[PDB]
């Protein structure tokens, strides 16, 4: 599946690949190497509730492939500025960090967390990941020119920022390739309209253009508080389609290949309100499960997982319940226990890993969208020793393959 920058999912992960676990702890930085031999290791004293003043509300915490070598590096966009950590390639860091921009942050530029969106993405196919930032006056973009050398912001698109509307509240963007091309262009589901940015290749947009009159808080009732939406490659063509999981349940638009879109449709009765699901209780994801590389759907449920297998042209299998685990009646809390659907193993199934009370748990995809027992893999990252979501920040991510 193609690489998708989300809200909800700042980091992607790689299919197929073997994803690291990262913490953003009290104390600092913290990483478990996806390997046989399996353990915590300190990587930075700094981008922490304790180590250095980092807040959820007021900061964002990334990993990012900076410098070309694909790596990941610990970006933190802080109070005066953004912050980077190297990997040197090693399980290490470079610490302390360096200062790269005075711009992207708090107290330079003037950025919030309830108003705009940060995110890290190669944008030009460089190699490297720009800054991407949905501001006030439009989308802004400081180049990564390699050697930590980031130039200053440029205006990518006076659009898609709150001068034009947009609201965490209503609506949701996304980076994509909707054109097949390789380049990430914006989609955005507005307030009456989802829109769509056409990328130049060279740190700015195409006008957006209207292209699906659903979807929206203002066309046809979605609401952020009840309606979760995604774009995903559903039918292997390379481009983002979009899946919502509505009231009845699952409904998709799929690309026609250029960036428009065709109809609205209706393709499962599942996974909505109308079945039980809500955003307070439950996870609902969008990830390739099996050989055909297109996005299945899953859901941490109440009973446990359940997933629905894509046929593999954006229509969907049974819902079955494939793991009596990682669901509500089992204890696990959207506010309590971050839980990812990413490739653990290296062969493009997707596998599910959960930050449970305890331990940090995980399940094996067999290869088929089926999985293995509950595998309990470390007692770190936890509940029980003191990483709540107020305080701390944890991602799947890929920090070497
Ligand atoms: C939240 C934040 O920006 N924290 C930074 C910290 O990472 C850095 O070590 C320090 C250097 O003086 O400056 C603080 O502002
Ligand atoms: C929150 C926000 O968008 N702040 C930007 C700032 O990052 C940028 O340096 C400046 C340049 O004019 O424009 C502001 O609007
Ligand atoms: C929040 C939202 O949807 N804002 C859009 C804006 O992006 C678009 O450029 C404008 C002109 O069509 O219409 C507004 O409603
Ligand atoms: C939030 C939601 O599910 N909205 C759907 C909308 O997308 C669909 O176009 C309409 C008529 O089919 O039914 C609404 O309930
Ligand atoms: C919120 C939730 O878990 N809803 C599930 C639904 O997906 C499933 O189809 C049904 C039959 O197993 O069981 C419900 O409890
Ligand atoms: C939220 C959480 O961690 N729940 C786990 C559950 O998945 C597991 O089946 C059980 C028995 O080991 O232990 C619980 O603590
Ligand atoms: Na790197
Ligand atoms: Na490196
Ligand atoms: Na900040
Ligand atoms: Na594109
Ligand atoms: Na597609
Ligand atoms: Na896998």
Redesign the pocket.
């Known amino acids: 599946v193609t690489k998708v920058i989300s809200q909800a999912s700042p980091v992607p992960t790689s299919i197929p690949g073997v994803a690291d676990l990262v913490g953003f702890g009290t104390g600092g930085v913290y990483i478990i190497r996806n390997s046989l031999l399996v353990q915590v290791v300190k990587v930075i004293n700094?981008?922490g509730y304790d180590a250095?003043?980092?807040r959820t509300e007021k900061?964002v915490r990334l990993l990012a492939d900076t410098t070309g070598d694909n790596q990941s590096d610990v970006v933190?966009f802080?109070?005066?500025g953004v912050?980077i950590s190297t990997n040197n390639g090693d399980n290490t860091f470079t610490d302390?960090?360096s200062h790269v921009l005075a711009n992207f942050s708090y107290l330079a530029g003037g950025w919030r967390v309830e108003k705009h969106i940060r995110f890290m993405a190669d944008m030009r196919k460089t190699g490297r990941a720009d800054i991407v930032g949905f501001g006030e006056a439009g989308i802004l973009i400081s180049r990564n020119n390699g050697s930590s050398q980031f130039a200053p912001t440029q205006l990518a698109l006076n659009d898609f920022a709150y001068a034009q509307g947009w609201r965490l509240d209503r609506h949701l963007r996304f980076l994509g390739d909707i054109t097949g091309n390789g380049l990430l262009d914006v989609v955005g589901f507005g307030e009456n309209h989802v829109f769509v940015a056409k990328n130049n290749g060279n740190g700015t947009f195409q006008p957006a253009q209207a292209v699906v009159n659903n979807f929206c808080v203002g066309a046809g009732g979605w609401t952020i508080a009840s309606h979760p939406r995604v774009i995903a490659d559903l039918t292997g063509d390379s481009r983002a389609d979009i899946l919502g999981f509505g009231g009845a349940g699952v409904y998709t638009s799929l690309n026609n290949g250029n960036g428009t879109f065709g109809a609205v449709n209706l393709v499962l009765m599942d996974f909505g309100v109308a079945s039980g699901w809500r955003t307070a209780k439950h996870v609902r994801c969008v990830a390739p499960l099996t050989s055909k590389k297109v996005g299945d759907i899953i859901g941490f449920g109440d009973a446990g997982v359940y997933v629905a297998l894509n046929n593999g042209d954006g229509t969907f299998g049974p819902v079955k319940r494939v793991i009596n685990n990682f669901g509500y009646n089992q204890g696990w809390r959207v506010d309590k226990h971050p839980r990812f659907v990413v490739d653990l193993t290296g062969d493009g199934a997707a596998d599910i890993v959960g930050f449970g009370e305890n331990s940090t748990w995980a399940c094996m995809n067999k290869g088929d969208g089926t999985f293995g027992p509950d595998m309990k893999l470390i007692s770190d990252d936890t509940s029980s020793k003191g990483w709540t979501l107020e305080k701390t920040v944890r991602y799947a991510a890929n920090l070497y393959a």
């Open positions: 700094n981008f250095g003043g980092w900061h933190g802080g109070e005066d912050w302390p960090p």
